[PDB]
Symmetry: C2
Subunit: 126 residues, 2 copies
């Protein structure tokens, strides 16, 4: 029986290596593989890929959602490591946690420009 198992988002970057370095060293992901054009990282078994692109408009329009358990802990874990000045696009940044219809989440913009939403679902949203 054909069954889908899991999804892996693909982030975009002009510079895959530097973007991957941020996800590993700042955000605490583990390296899976790296090539000039394609990298992979993981944390708690959850995989993320990073692919090279030529145009900055692509990462500036690229998003992913990552579901999390204990979003408050996660935000605290990164708050000394990632700037809260989201309005300044010259560095990576993280928003405050906010309520959304389906739970709570914060946004993190990485050095390549990708916006990743870290989200904790209400049990009613399962």
């Amino acid at each position: 029986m054909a069954v889908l198992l899991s999804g892996v988002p693909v982030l975009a970057a002009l510079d895959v290596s530097t973007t991957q370095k941020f996800w590993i060293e700042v955000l605490g992901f583990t390296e899976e593989f790296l090539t000039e054009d394609f990298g992979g990282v993981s944390r708690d078994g959850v995989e993320l890929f990073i692919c090279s692109v030529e145009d900055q408009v692509v990462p500036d329009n690229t998003q992913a959602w990552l579901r999390v358990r204990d979003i408050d802990a996660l935000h605290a874990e990164w708050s000394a490591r990632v700037s809260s000045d989201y309005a300044d696009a010259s560095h990576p940044a993280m928003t405050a946690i906010r309520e959304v219809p389906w739970g709570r989440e914060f946004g993190l913009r990485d050095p390549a420009g990708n916006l990743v939403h870290f989200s904790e679902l209400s049990e009613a949203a399962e």
Copy 2:
């Protein structure tokens, strides 16, 4: 020890100039289940595996956007969709699906949707 956040799962986000048309493809051609739809943002799922679709203004973005989806029984999945998706990948005027090919980590096929996103369906070896 103190609380430490855990990542649970990832949700890829595809890009489209036309979210509703792209979402209709994922539902009616690929057999995904609708989660939600708005003008700028839609969501679908299959076997609990979630995929989002977000509006963009520049066709360069979906033409550089990818996702990986892990699967069990890739042959059965490919057979299901061979009834509804063209095998002529080189013709970019329609959505298309490649043959299943051997890769270092298992087997996979690619599927290009009407918005231009490329999604890799992959069955890991072992």
